[PDB]
């Protein structure tokens, strides 16, 4: 399981994207890859 979190001060855009990412990857069955 991979979890992305943009460092530093949070922006509206980063939070808008986090909410979409939560739905996609934590609730609906999307799979984060990372290497």
């Amino acid at each position: 399981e991979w979890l992305y979190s943009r460092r530093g001060v949070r922006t509206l855009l980063s939070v808008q994207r986090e909410k979409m990412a939560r739905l996609r990857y934590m609730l609906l069955g999307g799979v984060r890859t990372h290497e």
Partner: protein, 227 residues
């Protein structure tokens, strides 16, 4: 023979997530020749795309069947008909709320003097959901047929995704101090609106007093009221 892909470098596309079935806004960064595989040895291309809302995923290699021209044409309510295969908004986690963009076959349409009802069979990752009640009946997109129309290379058609703010319904022509700038209510420059680590409200750097010329380089940030 020379590569002659349907979609070109820099073209605006939709790219499908094969795990959960949704179509996401992306841009083509490269087109490469796919090594034919046994037994049929069909020729194909791989699209390398970058996703608008998932830049942290970097450049992602896509099967050609999972890329198409960015949706741009809305099928108005009166033109919708049973049997049409369209791209529409649905949220399997919360069907009464906005979610993501999926292929769907319209399966029923009803209209009374008080209500408009649309049902569709929504295609997810590995299965379908039959007879989903579709909330966003005025945001049903035609699926572009390959070759028809011009490539979208600028001036992209914007879609809303994810659950919407209950104050403003994410209406781009409305201000909202709850989900956008707490001071002016404006949606513009979301990359330059700071989020208070206490109250979680948004603030344009240029609406603060004193205004800030850029996003601060700190671990955290708190608004005037929470300081």
């Amino acid at each position: 023979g020379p590569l002659g892909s349907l979609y070109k470098v820099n073209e605006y596309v939709d790219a499908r997530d094969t795990n959960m079935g949704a179509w996401f806004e992306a841009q083509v960064v490269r087109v490469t020749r796919k090594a034919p595989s046994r037994p049929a040895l069909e020729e194909d291309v791989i699209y390398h795309v970058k996703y608008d809302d998932y830049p942290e995923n970097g450049v992602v290699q896509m099967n050609s069947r999972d890329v198409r021209a960015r949706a741009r044409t809305i099928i108005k309510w009166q033109d919708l008909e049973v049997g049409q295969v369209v791209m529409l908004n649905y949220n399997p986690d919360n069907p009464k709320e906005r979610g993501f963009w999926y292929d769907a076959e319209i399966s029923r349409k009803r209209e009374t003097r008080t209500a408009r009802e649309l049902y569709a069979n929504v295609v997810l990752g590995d299965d379908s959901l039959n007879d989903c009640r579709i909330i966003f009946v005025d945001e049903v997109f035609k699926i572009e047929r390959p070759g028809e129309g011009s490539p979208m290379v600028d001036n992209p058609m914007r879609r809303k995704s994810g659950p919407s703010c209950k104050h403003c319904k994410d209406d781009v022509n409305r201000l909202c101090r709850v989900c956008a700038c707490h001071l002016c209510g404006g949606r513009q420059d979301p990359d330059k609106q700071l989020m208070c680590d206490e109250c979680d409200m948004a603030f344009h750097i240029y609406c603060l007093d004193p205004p800030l010329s850029s996003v601060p380089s700190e671990d955290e940030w708190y608004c005037p009221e929470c300081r």
